[PDB]
Amino acid sequence: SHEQFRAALQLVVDPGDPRSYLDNFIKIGEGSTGIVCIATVRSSGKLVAVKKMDLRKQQRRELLFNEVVIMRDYQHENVVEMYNSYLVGDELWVVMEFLEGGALTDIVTHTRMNEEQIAAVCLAVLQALSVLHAQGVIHRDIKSDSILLTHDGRVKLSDFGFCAQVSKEVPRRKSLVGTPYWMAPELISRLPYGPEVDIWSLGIMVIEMVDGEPPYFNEPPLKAMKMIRDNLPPRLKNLHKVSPSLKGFLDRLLVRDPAQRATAAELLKHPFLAKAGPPASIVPLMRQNR
């Protein structure tokens, strides 16, 4: 069964073993599905990232295919580029673009973003989501941890391990997936849902960028979910620290009824995004420059 699954993965991944061309693996991160390492390409000295996922440690093993489906089919400026996949012993390894600026989480937990920087993040994320959503791909784990940065401040969406596809034949998903504090209310309620859930989750990430943490963050996950489900949309702690344009923007995101929530395509036209600075504006937020 584990052996059964390893055989199945073998048929979809690239042959061989990237240890044959990579040196000096150093762990830089963890997620829910496994670890992320930096590695050096021996021929070039260039750096790549390698995501390692133990097949025996997944809640839903079959979701590991999402790594392969996205790599093969859905590449974009604001999406982390995946180069090759391999089966190495009991682990799936994906060799991918190294985002040397780290994750948006390290920024929001340690500094205050201004609205030029917030708008720049939101615009980049919404450009990615508009393209993904138009092809039926729902990310389902939008949060600051999934947004990665280059040294020069370019913003890219990562961690597609929990994504799903909708289509005319499967118009909604039903699975309980994501990270509790960021989950849409319709998804916690176990209603069938669509791309709208990413827009809610993006709202919660805006609250992260303003407040430093999502709502209810010092409640246990199950209680926080219950509160998201039953209560009016969560509020900024610091409502006085946001412009009316940012507040107006956020009110299109954190809408309980998914039919009334803005779509990514609509949000790209919102006047808040007119504030977006260039990638350069993000650079001073990163650990190496603060």
Binding site: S32, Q59, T179, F217, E219, P220
Partner: peptide
């Protein structure tokens, strides 16, 4: 509490 841990 304060869980950056997915499902």
């Amino acid at each position: 509490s304060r869980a950056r841990y997915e499902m």
